[PDB]
Amino acid sequence: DPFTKTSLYESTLKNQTDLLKVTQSTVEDFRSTNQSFTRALEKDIANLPYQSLITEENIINNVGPILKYYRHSINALNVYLGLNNGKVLLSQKSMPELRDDLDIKTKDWYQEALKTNDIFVTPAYLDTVLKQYVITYSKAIYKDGKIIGVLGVDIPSEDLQNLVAKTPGNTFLFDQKNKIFAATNKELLNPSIDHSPVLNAYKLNGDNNFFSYKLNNEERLGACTKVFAYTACITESADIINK
Ligand SMILES: N[C@@H](Cc1ccccc1)C(=O)O
Numbered sequence: 001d002p003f004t005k006t007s008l009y010e011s012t013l014k015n016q017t018d019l020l021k022v023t024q025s026t027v028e029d030f031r032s033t034n035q036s037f038t039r040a041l042e043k044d045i046a047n048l049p050y051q052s053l054i055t056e057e058n059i060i061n062n063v064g065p066i067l068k069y070y071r072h073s074i075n076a077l078n079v080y081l082g083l084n085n086g087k088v089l090l091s092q093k094s095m096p097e098l099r100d101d102l103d104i105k106t107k108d109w110y111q112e113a114l115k116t117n118d119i120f121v122t123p124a125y126l127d128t129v130l131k132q133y134v135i136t137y138s139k140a141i142y143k144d145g146k147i148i149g150v151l152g153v154d155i156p157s158e159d160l161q162n163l164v165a166k167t168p169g170n171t172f173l174f175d176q177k178n179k180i181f182a183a184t185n186k187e188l189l190n191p192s193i194d195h196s197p198v199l200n201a202y203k204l205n206g207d208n209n210f211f212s213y214k215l216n217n218e219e220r221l222g223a224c225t226k227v228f229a230y231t232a233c234i235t236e237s238a239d240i241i242n243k
């Protein structure tokens with residue numbers, strides 16, 4: 001009876017929407033926690049006297065311990081401060097050293113931090129120091145309007161993947177390039193899987209709008225929404241309304 005089918009559709013739409021939102025919140029909370037951490041670190045560095053900032057040896061001895069404590073506190077992969085002379089004070093998982101051989105001005109995390117007064121968040125990429133995929137939070141640190149350097153904080157992208165995977169629902173994230181990034185169902189990360197139907201249904205319907213689509217001649221229901229540069233989606237079988 002159409003009344004009963006409508007009731008099932010509305011119920012499942014509510015559940016799946018709710019679960020999509022949980023995945024959205026997971027991504028949001030991950031980012032905001034790492035931004036707050038980065039901002040705190042910025043503040044602690046900039047609150048040092050200038051004397052503690054204006055020689056490289058003072059950077060090593062005064063900023064180094066701060067990088068290291070902060071790194072430990074959140075279990076970050078790397079925490080670093082890059083200077084306009086090309087040197088970088090690097091605290092890496094494994095005494096922070098001032099490294100001259102790391103080409104920092106070619107890095108997006110460095111370049112882009114100088115172009116905004118906000119924290120800059122990179123897409124995930126392979127860290128060259130420890131060769132893990134990371135999300136980098138970078139921030140140009142200023143004291144009295146004077147640049148000190150660019151702070152960077154590397155968090156393993158696996159951390160976010162793991163958080164998403166734990167969420168209820170058949171939820172998943174695409175990155176910026178509409179490549180699959182995270183999923184509750186590990187099998188969805190099989191890289192040969194096409195996601196055109198979901199993506200095309202999302203493009204036709206827009207954020208948070210529940211849609212029907214087909215997989216192997218069978219009906220499925222889903223919704224997607226933008227979360228930062230990611231696309232979060234949920235999908236389920238349509239059996240709940242049909243059977
Ligand atoms: N994850 C950073 C690590 C790094 C810091 C400082 C200099 C060089 C590299 C990167 O790969 O760019």
Ligand SMILES: [Cl-]
Nearest residue numbers: 030031121135
């Ligand atoms: Cl993030």
